[PDB]
Symmetry: C2
Subunit: 161 residues, 2 copies
Amino acid sequence: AMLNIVLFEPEIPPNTGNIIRLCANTGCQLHLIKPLGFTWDDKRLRRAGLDYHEFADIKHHHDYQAFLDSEKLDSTQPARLFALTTKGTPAHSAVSYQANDYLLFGPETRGLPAYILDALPAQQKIRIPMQADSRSMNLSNAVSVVVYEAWRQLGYPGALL
Amino acid sequence: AMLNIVLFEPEIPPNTGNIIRLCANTGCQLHLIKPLGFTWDDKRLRRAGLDYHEFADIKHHHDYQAFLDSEKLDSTQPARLFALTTKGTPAHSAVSYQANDYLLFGPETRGLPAYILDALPAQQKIRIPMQADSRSMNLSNAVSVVVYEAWRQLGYPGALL
């Protein structure tokens, strides 16, 4: 894959719909780690405005370990997996992205759990810069920012020129 | 202002709510050019999860010319106004942004009208790169991408470090 976008237990349906469209438009592979916070239904997805090809090839994983095992990533410390957390060290734009990187995002109302984050090196925990005393960014907006920054760094391979 | 985000006739309420949060978190000034496609109500905005300070200082303009006149921009060719259009020339990241730039976005179901776009030089019409045969990006995701790219170029002034 060019980039792998990984949603851990996403909760709010329109964020995931928007992220499906994002991934389709940019050539990224989407991964969804269950449980989802909303019902998953091809008819709802079609009703939302998505075409079959935009969702058909999403990789679905029954838990985090299943994702790691599917992608042959080390559980002690997965390589080239960057987790979005307001408690991260480097800005999302301060990392140097590579093809096939994994971009991990937590649920809207919780973020990623400590068992995940505490296993990752500081430089694999990325933060989207915000002013002092900010509030929660919309998840699909956050994912879009990180994806487009990564894709920019890669020179937008696959973009129509 | 650090950056000015200008929505022309926005249509879908959650996109504007998300963009309000975006602008609050990044220190941008939001401008809304009427008519909006949804009812504007402080109580709905509060219900959506926004605090008063996030929306109180939005600049509201009754039409495009009123926006131009408010901001002392030339109508024949406004300076440092970049309009998002799939028909633009430079990628959004190929422009060099400056403090107080204006970032103009059209409605979700229409984009910007030709009377606006045809007045702007090619290098002021920016495009978000997408793969061949893509579909419409969510407006709040698009605005987030452009805002964060601009803010990155500026060195994230005002961000908590």
